[PDB]
Write a protein that binds this ligand. Structure first.
Ligand code: CYC
Ligand code: CYC
Ligand code: CYC
Ligand code: CYC
Ligand code: CYC
Ligand code: CYC
Ligand code: CYC
Ligand code: CYC
Ligand code: CYC
Lengths: 92, 160, 160, 54, 173, 161, 97, 98, 160, 161, 161, 160
């Protein structure tokens, strides 16, 4: 279901990205960032634009924001376009 | 450096450094000054060594020095010693931060396409570093040159 | 049915069924007595629901039965009513399953590929199902006509 | 021309040689008819010259 | 993978017992040759690009067929330079994973990362298994040329290369 | 994935010899029919939907695979057919241009009869659909072009059998 | 020894492209019949055809003359063209140019 | 050396018979580097520019065939004197990969 | 056109254009003189190609113009011929572009959604384009009629 | 295990109908080629050992599967080949007479590619041996008879792939 | 992504009118230069690496961006340049064939100057590299062809500015 | 070898090895020093043992090398001696293994199927091995010639 079942350290599925997203979450951000690949010079793949602006969901913004810095990216701006704040029920 | 590899390698698993890794930082920091004492030995012999590198890279490869080769001319040979100076300067960085990243984030990653767009034969540069390692053995005693030996042949492995 | 996709919904989410899902499987099975009565009305009224269904279909779309229409002649007109007997049958399945899941994977998924590949005007067969809907809802009370008509218009929606 | 003239006896076919022209050698199989040595085997060919004449 | 140590510890865990002295004697034999296992490895990094080059010429000097057209058997030997480029690349791997496996003191890294599917992969591309194994031991004799006056480094160097040889064989006997 | 030129070059290369008179003799034979194959592949691209509509209506339209219980009953299952028949008429067009059926078994034939047995698709009705589809394809492209396009249809039918 | 096996399917690695070849594959990868632009692609290289083929035989026929005239330039020591060995596979034959 | 002066005549007469010069490009890119130690490279560029000078003896120039095969010779000889491509590397993300 | 999608093909593949792609851009531009003559014939024959196009369309499909048909009445029938003037125009674009790329993203992509949403029988408009094709190919020689008709039948294929 | 007549009778029986004009139309087509298949199967029986000797010498005789380490090195392993190639040339003869490749997958193809992977037999060299064996078989029986016998060889090569 | 023919068809279509004399007048002007553009794109494909090697050595080879501290010091950073300059010489070749610079801003210009500011890439040295690359391109393709290929280089330099 | 089949013998019988089996593994390994000397003699005498082996083979069987013989010409005669180099190699294996088990599953099992399927006279290759035997036993003393000849005649027996 959601990503906070009871998993933490020392648990059977591997220790990973745990987001505070509810059941079928409907909140999503509008993020903007550059993310240079830092791996094209030994792979020699084709090049793709690294400056992107896209709507990521609340269910997986934290994983994406945690990963964009993994590969040296810089986050220029993020906002919560869709969803409420301090909302107990209704994020579903 | 080596601590940076442990912080990074422990960070993609979302955990603190384990028992073995903290050895790898602790043992690295206890051998600290000996890298510091060693790099000052090499910095005082940079004019020592690159003069000896130009000895054998060109008696081995007179193709490059001759008229028509890339290194023909004064100003082409002028930077020729500069590339030795930057490489030797990079190795002092690698000898200090006890790993290969300063030899890899600089110098190694994409070096062939740099030289291939310059006309420098990439095989000749491999012998240049091999020449440079051959030159460092004379101004260095047997104790500490095998400390610096594995940092040289990584460059040769990186260039092939 | 409502039972099978309320399961496969909670199946994918790695969880059991909520009260919202189990108070409706409960609410559906107590509804099961009333569903079989509704499907029992359409079961042995297919003679009138189909034949009067194709009644208004030809009066509203004489092109499809006129010479050049897809259902022209004694042959195609028989198959012209055969499909209405199919879709009237699937509505009896959807009423008993409490969902258009039987109607979904039979007669709806990829229906435009079939009828486009048969030369049949897909809008024409949509007009046929609407004519059957007025005959079907005329056979039942208001509480039932909000269901039996309810499954036809879903078939109307997916058929265009 | 057939030249079927007479006295077509059967026994005693003799010897000599002629090696008549091929045909149909105008077809097109993609593989040759195979041989053997080369690489791995120049040693023994040169060396079966030794006994070839015996 | 598993080194000589972890392979030893799994040996005593399966039986669920602590490490006795026969177990520790096996670990000590690694710790004695462990310092000798490195300059074997350090010599390989200094002699890596060379040792592949002597292996190739020593190979094709006996297998000239590998540099020739395949015959109608669409077989992958070093016919074209595209074939030759990738075919030298395999000698990279056999020297590499046999270099780690010298340091681990155990062939656990060999079979799971080299042997598993090796006959699978070569049977697909129709690659020579015979000459492929012979180049593996041309490297072994070439590496043992350096450490030759004594003979306790020789058994260390032989163990990875000998393991690939016995395992890549279709068993005649 | 080899055409007639690729297959000729492969056999001439696999013996390490140059392109002799016999290898070029077949290549000249392929270039002579190069004009015929494009026009054959031209009209087949135009009448792709019409050919498949003609084959199914002529072979398996009203048989009881079409009726309930038959292998083609539901609309998803019927729609899979014309999707499925499109590949046979399409890949056969590729073999007709390349002049070599290597693309068929590379991308169609392998794991095909083993897949229909899994789904329970009737191989008997499938081949007759392709045979009827081969019959209409000879209508459009002509006789000899139909002989060429027809030469790869039964190749599919043979291996799919 | 390996105690399992995934199987070895027959795989033909790529060797080169041809003009008759890749355009058949490009529309192939997009899941479509080639269009009239690409049908115009496959046709006039076939229309090159015999022009390409005759270039082979005229080049193939005097192959020794093409190779020998290079031998006169950059090989001292008389002829030095004896080491030619045209059949490079050790086959008896099927046919020879 | 005669075997390779052979082969340069060959894939050219496979590139003419094929569509493109691509088969030459794959087998001539890193070729000069591999044989660079047992060969003076300039003793190949002389030999490869003798084949075009010889092969241009065959055709009436400024006809269509003269421009076809000439363009295929300079694809192999000029690209012969050209640095070899760098090896592509596939570094893995986590431990168990190789 | 053939120029723009031969580019975007080789664009996606990270490569330049092959001889197979550049000997056809070459072959297309030398074909450009003959293409403008063909499109010039259809340009000022739209009065006959459209009006005779709707000639056979109503004789073959009197339902669409009869009372109840979609194109019923003087001021629609006008729109009934307007669409044929559209599709006849797009064929002139496809002939000059050497491809149905202009016809693809105009009048073909999502055409079934429009005509289904307008109540128009999409099969009927397909019959209209076929009637225009016989008039168009009757205006040109055999070498041209294999092209001008060639773009109509593609529009026939995508329109059903 | 069905021939052309068995397959025609099965399809005509499986619908419960008599042998109409279309079912007998194919049967007449099979009886026309009945004279060709026997003479094709006649010469193949005579030159069975000669055909297999020609195929192995033309495809995989001197390749390094023949040398040590290759898949065919030991005499038991070499002798298994000509035993193994005999079935392909023999069962293909049965398919050529029966006019239906049902006997091949019934008795040859099933568990075959799954068996060679177990033994580690190279499927690539196997198909080229059968392809070369198909090439010599077209030499003996002629063109059209070679087209018939060749039609079942690649059926083995397709499924064995 | 429009060529000269696509742009002419779009403007003539966007008003719903046929291709009048003015629309075909420009199309005839494009077909006249069709022979020049292919030969221009021919030699540029041949001397792609040579042109980029000439531009960097003539514009920014020895400047202190090349020396420690500048934004092209490290080998990864130097290798990114010739990778980066390859697109400018490549996409400019596409604009020269298509006769319309729509592909440049579609696939190169948008988010480009906004990207170099993020990385801190000097736009000043970039344009002079393209200007020097434009200068050598006029050497190969000639004067008027250099005028055509040069017309898209400064289009990149203008928008990238 | 004697070690492996003395095991698989006692393996099948559900028992260990008797003194009769273990006093011979013992007796064989003390024999191992003398076996390597014998195999060492045949190892670098293959030039004479094979070439003189084919010497007497052609003088005794000129049919096989005459025109029409299987080993006719420069080609087959090279392979004609290649097989003798094979069988001479297997005898070196049998001497070191102390048994014809290496010779059994290599060059003996199914050998008649190969040579019958190659057109080679199997009796002719048997004559070749006998000619090698007289050359081999002429190179060793009487105590050794009772062994080296002993493995050849087993190969002679199984090869007919
Ligand atoms: C590694 C650097 C880093 C940080 C720090 C980070 C923070 C971060 N904190 C979050 C939420 C949150 N953070 C808090 C925290 C707090 N509430 C309080 O009253 C306190 C003041 C505070 C605890 C100290 C809460 C309650 C949420 C949930 C908000 C919501 O559901 O709307 C979220 C939304 C997604 C998720 O949690 O799955 C992110 C991405 N991400 C990163 O990559
Ligand atoms: C920190 C890592 C690093 C390196 C190594 C580097 C190299 C580098 N070498 C260059 C040129 C050159 N390099 C050489 C080099 C040589 N000729 C020989 O015979 C020798 C084997 C070799 C020198 C030891 C020559 C001849 C040129 C000039 C080529 C030309 O412009 O014509 C250039 C162009 C500008 C310049 O000289 O500064 C760079 C950037 N940049 C870097 O950031
Ligand atoms: C259960 C879901 C389902 C449906 C709907 C279905 C339809 C279906 N309709 C068919 C034919 C047909 N359907 C029509 C239908 C029509 N003509 C008109 O004018 C009207 C607009 C329309 C009917 C209201 C005609 C004329 C044919 C015969 C077409 C021909 O013979 O070419 C056929 C081919 C013959 C057959 O096997 O019956 C199928 C399979 N199959 C299914 O499994
Ligand atoms: C880590 C262990 C490991 C190995 C060894 C390995 C091998 C391997 N060798 C390959 C190809 C190949 N290997 C060769 C090798 C040879 N040709 C000969 O004639 C010689 C016998 C031999 C050189 C010794 C050739 C020619 C190909 C290409 C086959 C072709 O495309 O024709 C390929 C397919 C290309 C690719 O790499 O994607 C793989 C995967 N992979 C692995 O993971
Ligand atoms: C390009 C080579 C290639 C082929 C040929 C191919 C076939 C293929 N046919 C399928 C299904 C199918 N194929 C049919 C076909 C038929 N029913 C009949 O009665 C007829 C005899 C026949 C039409 C001629 C049907 C009905 C299904 C759906 C089966 C199901 O839902 O269980 C499926 C299952 C998945 C899907 O359709 O999405 C595949 C993968 N895949 C390939 O990659
Ligand atoms: C069809 C395109 C093509 C070519 C040409 C090719 C050549 C090729 N030449 C080779 C070696 C060689 N090539 C040559 C000689 C020469 N080469 C020349 O182009 C000159 C004419 C001459 C020097 C003047 C020599 C001496 C060797 C042996 C080098 C060594 O021992 O490593 C090798 C390594 C295997 C071998 O020993 O033959 C290849 C793969 N491969 C190809 O796919
Ligand atoms: C360039 C591609 C393209 C097309 C094809 C197109 C069609 C199109 N057809 C329309 C109407 C219409 N189209 C028809 C057509 C027909 N009636 C029949 O009986 C025949 C079967 C058929 C014509 C042959 C009719 C009757 C209307 C008016 C419908 C109404 O008033 O409700 C309309 C709404 C009115 C208008 O703005 O013109 C559009 C936009 N637009 C486009 O951009
Ligand atoms: C097809 C249109 C297009 C362009 C042009 C493009 C550019 C682009 N240039 C980049 C970097 C770069 N570009 C340069 C370029 C230069 N340094 C200098 O001094 C010069 C002025 C200049 C060479 C002319 C350098 C050094 C980097 C690496 C920056 C870094 O590692 O921080 C990157 C970061 C990622 C990577 O290279 O893998 C992108 C995405 N992407 C595109 O999609
Ligand atoms: C280790 C056990 C072993 C043996 C013995 C063996 C034999 C063997 N002998 C062969 C050929 C041959 N063998 C001969 C032999 C002879 N001609 C004569 O006149 C003599 C009687 C006789 C030799 C003394 C000939 C002529 C051929 C070539 C036949 C042909 O080309 O058709 C071949 C096919 C070519 C090859 O791959 O070498 C094999 C595999 N393989 C093995 O693994």
């Amino acid at each position: 279901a959601y990503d906070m079942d009871g998993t933490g350290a020392g648990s059977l599925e591997p220790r990973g990205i745990k987001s505070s997203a509810v059941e079928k979450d409907s909140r999503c951000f509008k993020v903007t960032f550059v993310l240079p690949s830092q791996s094209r010079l030994y792979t020699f793949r084709e090049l793709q634009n690294v400056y992107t602006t896209k709507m990521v969901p609340f269910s997986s913004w934290y994983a994406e924001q945690q990963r964009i810095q993994k590969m040296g990216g810089k986050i220029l701006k993020v906002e919560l376009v869709a969803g409420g704040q301090m909302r107990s029920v209704g994020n579903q | 450096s080596l601590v940076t590899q442990v912080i990074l390698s422990a960070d993609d698993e979302l955990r603190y450094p384990t028992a073995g890794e903290l050895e790898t930082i602790s043992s690295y920091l206890k051998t600290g000054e000996y890298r510091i004492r060693l790099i000052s030995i090499l910095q005082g012999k940079e004019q020592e060594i690159i003069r000896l590198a130009s000895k054998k890279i060109f008696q081995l490869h007179p193709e490059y020095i001759a008229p028509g080769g890339n290194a023909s001319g004064a100003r082409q040979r002028a930077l020729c010693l500069r590339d030795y100076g930057w490489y030797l300067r990079l190795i002092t960085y690698a000898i200090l931060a006890g790993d290969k990243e300063p030899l890899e984030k600089i110098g190694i990653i994409g070096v062939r396409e740099m030289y291939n767009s310059l006309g420098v034969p990439i095989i000749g540069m491999i012998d240049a570093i091999k020449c440079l390692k051959e030159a460092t053995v004379e101004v260095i005693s047997q104790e500490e040159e095998d400390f610096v030996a594995p940092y040289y042949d990584y460059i040769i492995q990186g260039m092939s | 049915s409502i039972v099978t996709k309320s399961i496969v919904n909670a199946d994918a989410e790695a969880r059991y069924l909520s009260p919202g899902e189990l108070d409706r499987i409960k609410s559906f099975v107590l509804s099961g007595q009333r569903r079989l009565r509704i499907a029992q009305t359409l079961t042995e009224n297919r003679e009138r629901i189909v034949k009067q269904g194709g009644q208004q279909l030809f009066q509203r779309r004489p092109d499809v039965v006129s010479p050049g229409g897809n259902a022209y002649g004694e042959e195609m007109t028989a198959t012209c009513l055969r499909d209405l007997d199919y879709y009237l049958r699937l509505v009896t399945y959807g009423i008993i399953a409490g969902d258009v899941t039987p109607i979904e994977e039979i007669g709806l998924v990829g229906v435009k590929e079939m009828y486009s590949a048969l030369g049949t005007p897909i809008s024409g067969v949509a007009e046929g199902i609407r004519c059957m809907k007025d005959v079907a809802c005329s056979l039942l009370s208001g509480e039932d006509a909000a269901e039996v008509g309810f499954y036809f218009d879903y078939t109307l929606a997916a058929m265009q | 021309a057939a030249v079927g003239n007479k006295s077509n006896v059967d026994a005693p076919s003799f010897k000599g040689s002629n090696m008549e022209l091929a045909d149909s050698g105008a077809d097109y199989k993609a593989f040759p008819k195979r041989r053997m040595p080369g690489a791995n085997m120049q040693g023994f060919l040169d060396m079966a010259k030794g006994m070839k004449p015996k | 993978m598993q080194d000589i140590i972890t392979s030893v510890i799994n040996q005593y865990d399966l039986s669920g017992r602590y490490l006795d002295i026969k177990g520790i004697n096996q670990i000590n034999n690694y710790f004695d040759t462990g310092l000798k296992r490195l300059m074997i490895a350090k010599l390989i990094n200094k002699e890596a690009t060379n040792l592949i080059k002597e292996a190739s010429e020593l190979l094709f000097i006996e297998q000239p067929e590998l540099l020739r057209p395949c015959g109608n058997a669409f077989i992958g030997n070093a016919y074209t330079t595209r074939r030759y480029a990738a075919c030298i690349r395999d000698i990279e791997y056999y020297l590499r994973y046999s270099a780690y496996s010298i340091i681990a003191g155990n062939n656990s890294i060999l079979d799971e990362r080299v042997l598993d599917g090796l006959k699978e992969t070569y049977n697909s591309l129709l690659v020579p298994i015979g000459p492929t194994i012979r180049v593996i031991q041309l490297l072994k004799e070439i590496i043992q040329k350096k450490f030759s006056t004594e003979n306790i480094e020789n058994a260390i160097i032989a163990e990875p290369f000998d393991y690939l040889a016995i395992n890549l064989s279709d068993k005649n006997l | 994935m080899q055409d007639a030129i690729t297959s000729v070059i492969n056999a001439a290369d696999v013996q390490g010899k140059y392109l002799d008179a016999n290898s070029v003799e077949k290549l000249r034979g392929y270039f002579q029919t190069g004009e015929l194959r494009v026009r054959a592949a031209a009209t087949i691209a135009a009448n792709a939907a019409t050919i498949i509509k003609e084959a199914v209506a002529k072979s398996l339209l009203y048989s009881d695979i079409t009726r309930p219980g038959g292998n083609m009953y539901t609309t998803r299952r019927y729609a899979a057919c014309i999707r499925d028949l499109d590949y046979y008429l399409r890949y056969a067009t590729y073999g007709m241009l390349a002049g070599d059926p290597s693309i068929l078994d590379e991308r169609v034939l392998n794991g095909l009869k083993e897949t229909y047995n899994s789904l329970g698709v009737p191989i008997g009705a499938t081949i007759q659909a392709i045979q009827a589809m081969k019959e209409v394809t000879g209508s459009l492209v002509g006789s000899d072009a139909g002989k060429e396009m027809g030469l790869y249809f039964d190749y599919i039918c043979s291996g799919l059998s | 020894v390996t105690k399992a096996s995934g199987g070895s399917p027959v795989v033909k690695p790529q060797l080169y492209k041809t003009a008759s070849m890749l355009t058949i594959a490009q529309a192939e990868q997009q899941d479509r019949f080639l269009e009239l632009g690409e049908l115009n692609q496959l046709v006039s290289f076939l229309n090159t055809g015999n022009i390409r083929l005759e270039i082979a035989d005229l080049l193939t026929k005097n192959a020794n003359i093409i190779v020998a005239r290079a031998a006169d330039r950059i090989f001292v020591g008389g002829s030095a063209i004896s080491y030619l060995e045209r059949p490079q596979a050790s086959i008896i034959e099927a046919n020879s140019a | 050396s005669l075997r390779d002066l052979d082969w340069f005549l060959r894939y050219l007469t496979y590139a003419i018979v094929a569509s493109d010069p691509n088969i030459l490009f794959v087998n001539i890119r890193g070729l000069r580097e591999i044989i660079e130690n047992a060969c003076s490279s300039a003793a190949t560029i002389v030999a490869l520019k003798e084949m075009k000078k010889t092969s241009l003896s065959l055709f009436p120039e400024n006809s269509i065939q003269k421009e076809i095969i000439e363009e295929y010779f300079n694809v192999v000889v000029d690209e012969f004197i050209n640095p070899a491509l760098t090896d592509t590397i596939r570094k893995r993300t986590s431990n168990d990969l190789q």
